[PDB]
Design a protein around this ligand. Structure first.
Ligand SMILES: *[C@@H]1O[C@H](CO)[C@@H](O)[C@H](O)[C@H]1NC(C)=O
Ligand SMILES: *[C@@H]1O[C@H](CO)[C@@H](O)[C@H](O)[C@H]1NC(C)=O
Ligand SMILES: *[C@@H]1O[C@H](CO)[C@@H](O)[C@H](O)[C@H]1NC(C)=O
Ligand SMILES: OC[C@H]1O[C@@H](O)[C@H](O)[C@@H](O)[C@@H]1O
Length: 606
């Protein structure tokens, strides 16, 4: 279709499948295996990207051009890598991925939304869609086109260090929150075939349903472990939301480190090819987790030749190496050259990769848009996070006895109030994991409003606010306080570091609540990724709020404390009496919760 140097794959007016086929038929083995390779920015250089025809880059947690980098610094970095990729023979653009799992959370100044467990507490799929939308804009602010989200794990045991990344122990709630997908990617058209990939264009991002499948079903919540459940329960609990994701055009699917009845997901042909591809008709690309193929073996990495064979024969399309690309490419090339992996498998992986890239407009808009940089941390997005934080809060107690005056909502005007606790003025703790680093961090790590800052922004000008992180009982009794707001809870974590068999909050936490509430009527705000042992905190407190990990916008907390809005959140998980009960889920036979799934007290706006 027209000039003498015409190349059909480069013609934006042509159908995606025709462009895919046209380009695939021109590629060498090296160019094909390159597409299948995703590398860390930390090992990327212009020569590495060209010489190995690399398909994809990522940032792992904390993998950033520098601390405090601006949106434009990110764009410049991503465009630098893209320029190298576009200078290859075929000029296939790379796709750049990142964990934007509660906003664009590796980036300084990005809006940080509540983590998924709190979003489950909202029962508000449209709010979740709007968070997807805003997160797409903040990702594209940084020049990035691909988010490793949503995590649609169904966490069945809160001892797991990633339980906060699950919207609920109830698969129906997780299913409902797959609205994140069309928020991130755009709505699919009226005619759409379930399982096809979709992204609307340059203001949206490719999504990723992860981690397939049963990541939240592991024994005793041990991260990356074995999920022991018959096929019926796998399909009834862990699988459903993947079909909702197919229906909404999720572009990619990431494979889990976990095993199912002793078989490593990253080696499971029956589930990855037989089920996801052949039965759900998924036509986007399947990506590994980070050194996920390595972890097929014990020790991990002890037979990388086998890792490559097993994973690629199982049906994985793109491998998150993410460092040893030379070894990955060499070993895979060897296997193809020896007939151990057929060309049909290579061509399928590359067809899927290219399909997503052409569908999302990456060949038309390979570079960043500098007018998008100002989307990062935009006040309108912060307003949305603030609404989400407030809606996520679950009020568990509001009065020690049925005849007490209800403590919440608290008055904005009082002569003197106390804000206390390790979590009252600590932005990093209120954001939790996957914020600036994977494990998260402590203190003022990004731009935001702590609980203390939000209190001061909310109260009448005549109200004196005193902060004391860990006051003793006498300080409180002597201070002339009208009431106290005390905030405590878990420290930031993710993955295996978060696995925890006792689920008791660190001290001083309870001891501060006791000292404060002992002296003055108190609202306790518990910051956690999951239910934790809570009877002792309840016994001391007039009121207590499960605030989960509400993110950067602390004013969401005070919005409900001071009665600007009423409490509406409902537990998205069972609150256990003891960890000896676990696992214990709604619908179980011996169900003896401290608070059942769906529990939540309400207030009315002042
Ligand atoms: C589960 O963890 C146990 C305890 O560390 C470990 O020995 C076992 O190999 C793990 N199993 C799987 C499938 O990952
Ligand atoms: C509970 O578990 C974590 C390790 O997972 C540990 O750091 C913490 O000290 C433990 N708490 C108690 C009460 O043993
Ligand atoms: C709030 O308003 C409702 C209905 O409009 C009322 O019936 C309810 O009891 C009120 N709730 C509280 C906690 O006062
Ligand atoms: O950061 C890249 C990846 O790291 C892995 O450890 C996690 O399991 C994934 O959820 C994440 O996308």
């Amino acid at each position: 279709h027209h000039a003498a140097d015409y190349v059909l794959y480069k013609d934006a007016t042509k159908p995606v499948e025709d462009r895919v086929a046209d380009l695939l038929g021109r590629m060498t083995l090296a160019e094909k295996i390159g597409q299948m390779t995703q590398i860390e920015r930390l090992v990327a250089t212009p020569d590495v990207l060209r010489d190995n025809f690399i398909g994809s880059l990522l940032s792992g947690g904390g993998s950033v051009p520098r601390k405090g980098a601006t949106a434009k610094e990110w764009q410049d970095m991503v465009d630098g890598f893209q320029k190298a990729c576009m200078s290859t023979r075929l000029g296939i653009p790379m796709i750049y991925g990142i964990d934007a799992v509660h906003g664009q959370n590796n980036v300084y100044g990005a809006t940080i939304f509540p983590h998924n467990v709190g979003l489950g507490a909202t029962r508000d799929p449209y709010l979740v869609k709007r968070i997807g939308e805003a997160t797409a804009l903040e990702v594209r602010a940084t020049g990035i086109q691909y988010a490793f989200a949503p995590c649609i794990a169904v966490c069945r045991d809160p001892r797991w260090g990633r339980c906060y990344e699950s919207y609920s122990e109830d698969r129906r709630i997780v299913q409902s929150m797959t609205e994140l997908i069309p928020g991130l990617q755009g709505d699919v058209p009226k005619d759409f075939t379930s399982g096809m990939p979709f992204v609307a264009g340059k203001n949206k991002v490719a999504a990723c349903a992860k981690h397939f499948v049963g990541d939240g079903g592991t024994v005793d919540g041990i991260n990356e472990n074995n999920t022991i459940i018959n096929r019926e329960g796998l399909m009834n609990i862990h699988m459903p939301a993947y079909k909702n994701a197919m229906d909404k055009g999720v572009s990619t699917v990431m494979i889990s480190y976990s095993s199912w009845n002793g078989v490593k997901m990253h080696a499971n042909q029956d589930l990855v090819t037989g089920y996801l591809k052949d039965t759900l008709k998924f036509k986007g690309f399947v990506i590994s987790d980070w050194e996920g193929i390595d972890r097929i073996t014990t020790p991990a990495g002890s037979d990388y030749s086998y890792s490559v064979k097993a994973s690629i024969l199982a049906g994985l399309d793109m491998i998150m190496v993410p460092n040893k690309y030379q070894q990955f490419i060499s070993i895979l090339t060897g296997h193809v050259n020896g007939g151990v992996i057929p060309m049909s498998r290579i061509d399928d992986a590359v067809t899927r990769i290219l399909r997503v890239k052409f569908t999302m407009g990456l060949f038309e808009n390979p570079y960043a848009d500098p007018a998008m940089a100002e989307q990062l941390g935009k006040q309108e997005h912060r307003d949305l996070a603030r609404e989400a934080a407030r809606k996520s809060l679950v009020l568990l107690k509001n009065g020690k006895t049925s005849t007490d005056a209800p403590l919440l909502p608290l008055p904005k005007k009082a002569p003197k109030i106390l804000v206390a606790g390790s979590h009252a003025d600590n932005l990093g703790y209120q954001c939790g994991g996957w914020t600036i680093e994977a494990q998260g961090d402590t203190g003022r790590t990004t731009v935001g409003t702590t609980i203390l800052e939000a209190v001061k922004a909310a109260v009448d000008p005549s109200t004196v606010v005193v902060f004391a992180e860990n006051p003793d009982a006498e300080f409180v009794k002597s201070g002339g306080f009208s009431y106290a707001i005390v905030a405590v809870g878990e420290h930031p974590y993710t993955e295996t570091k978060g696995d925890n068999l006792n689920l008791t909050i660190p001290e001083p936490g309870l001891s501060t609540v006791q000292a404060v509430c002992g002296g003055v009527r108190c609202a306790t705000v518990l910051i956690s990724g999951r239910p934790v042992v809570v009877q002792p905190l309840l016994a001391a407190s007039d009121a207590l709020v499960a605030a989960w990990l509400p993110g950067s916008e602390g004013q969401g907390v005070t919005d409900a404390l001071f009665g600007d809005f009423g409490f509406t959140g409902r537990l998205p998980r069972t609150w256990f009496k003891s960890v000896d009960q676990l696992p214990m889920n709604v619908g179980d036979a011996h169900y003896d919760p401290l608070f059942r799934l769906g529990y939540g007290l309400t207030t009315n706006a002042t």
